[PDB]
Write a protein that binds this ligand. Structure first.
Ligand SMILES: Nc1ncnc2c1ncn2[C@@H]1O[C@H](COP(=O)(O)O)[C@@H](O)[C@H]1O
Ligand SMILES: Nc1ncnc2c1ncn2[C@@H]1O[C@H](COP(=O)(O)O)[C@@H](O)[C@H]1O
Lengths: 214, 214
């Protein structure tokens, strides 16, 4: 029952879900990423979680796509007992997870919910988070490619207590990409990104792994 | 017993093994690629089989690494009955496959061996094969990035009946990458490659998928 697969899309919560699972003695046999044609090229920006999976040394399973049926199809081919998803999964995402899980007879392990507290915990845990998506007023394109720290957290809280932008970007406020965390054996360094409704998006063009102190 | 995983590294034989398996009514649940640090960047040249897996629509499992222990670890997490490998696997490769297979209690399905005949069959089946590796005298860097056809086959046979270079590159003579085959839903187009003992190597920098007639 310790054998599980983590739904990994690359952002702060997928990574927190991974850290949580490992710390709670779970046996993460696989990371699972679903790729939809809804978003074809050679750029690394297509295999970002693939870059993180190498930093982690953990096997990565990639599915392709009614995404519920495709997900269940992928997960059904794995020798696992449960599915690990972050406690910040979309209100809709949780429904799909619950549905496929039940139908497959799998457990839905999830971290047992204050935005501020959560965000602070990630920083204290050594999470290196970069903003790669933005879709909320009060967040100019300047936020793209920017890393979050005790400083950026303030600006988020200050922005929240004004434009009411979620502190944990819960709801599409902004997308993230984790460049480093305690479990990474290698750090991810962005060499070239270049930025593109107040909808922003950072397309990573050049990136590489760098060994950590260890 | 129909459920299997194909050891897919991207070349002509991995793809032939895949085609053979699908045609023989096997249920290919996953493609498995092992990535070793023995060969760190963002280039697509790292996720080439990932590009093919999208063209195929088949889930891809990627392992990281005694590669035998790592392979068995990956395959042990999949709900399969056997392993599919091409009949051209290295004389050593077959030993590892047999070892892990036996230890996991899995079947080792493999295509039931004339080089010329084999190479001709691939062309007749519509295989679009590009040379991305070279390590044999009589094969100048001009062969890198070159596509194989009834014409290139002759030059290979003519070269064989002289420098004794294997027709199926069996033994490290040359590495390949399949840009298209009947099972691909999309074709792979190389936009920018640039070439690098008579050891040659083609590093693909730009590539993309293009829809097929269907
Ligand atoms: N294939 C998937 N299906 C459903 N939910 C997913 C999938 N992949 C990732 N997630 C959820 O996405 C959340 C993380 O989003 P993020 O912080 O941007 O990486 C996690 O809490 C997961 O539960
Ligand atoms: N992870 C692996 N372990 C052992 N053999 C492999 C692995 N991946 C691919 N192969 C073998 O590599 C052969 C294909 O080489 P190629 O034609 O260059 O793609 C196949 O016949 C497979 O049996």
């Amino acid at each position: 029952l310790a054998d599980v697969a983590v739904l990994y899309s690359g952002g702060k919560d997928s990574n927190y879900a991974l850290y949580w699972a490992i710390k709670n003695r779970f046996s993460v046999k696989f990371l699972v990423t679903m790729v939809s044609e809804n978003e074809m090229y050679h750029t690394i920006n297509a295999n970002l979680t693939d870059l993180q999976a190498r930093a982690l040394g953990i096997p990565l399973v990639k599915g392709f796509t009614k995404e519920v049926e495709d997900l269940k199809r992928v997960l059904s081919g794995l020798k696992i007992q449960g599915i690990v998803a972050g406690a910040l999964a979309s209100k809709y995402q949780r429904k799909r997870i619950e549905k496929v899980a039940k139908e497959l007879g799998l457990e839905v392990y999830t971290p047992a919910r204050d935005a501020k507290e959560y965000m602070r915990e990630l920083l204290n845990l050594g999470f290196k988070i970069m903003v790669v998506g933005v879709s909320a007023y009060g967040l100019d394109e300047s936020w793209l490619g920017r890393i979050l720290d005790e400083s950026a957290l303030e600006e988020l809280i200050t922005l929240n207590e004004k434009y009411k932008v979620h502190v944990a970007g819960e709801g599409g406020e902004f997308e993230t990409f984790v460049l480093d965390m305690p479990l990474f054996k290698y750090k991810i360094v962005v060499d070239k990104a270049k930025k593109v409704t107040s909808s922003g998006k950072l397309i990573i063009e050049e990136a590489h792994l760098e060994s950590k102190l260890e």
